[PDB]
Amino acid sequence: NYSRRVFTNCNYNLTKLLSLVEVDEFVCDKTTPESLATGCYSSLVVDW
């Protein structure tokens, strides 16, 4: 039972998530974590 959030019409500070955790592995396709914090999106779906 996991939860999903969709963020639209707001400015995100993805550093807040990454400076609070330590990353053990990232798997990306068509993007990178360096470019996930700089690009502009239509929506941002987060499942955790």
Partner: protein, 48 residues
């Protein structure tokens, strides 16, 4: 240099963390091999 294996994903290609943006940015224009080695205390006592 010295770095733990818990941060082995911090040196990976594309990351928004402090190592790959302040400490070590790797040049991928040439043939490279990043070896995450480990030296135990028995070997690292005669060669000091």
């Amino acid at each position: 240099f010295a770095l733990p294996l818990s941060m082995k994903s911090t040196l990976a290609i594309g990351s928004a963390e402090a190592i790959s943006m302040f400490n070590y940015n790797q040049d991928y224009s040439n043939p490279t091999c990043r070896i995450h080695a480990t030296i135990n205390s028995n070997v690292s006592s005669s060669l000091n």
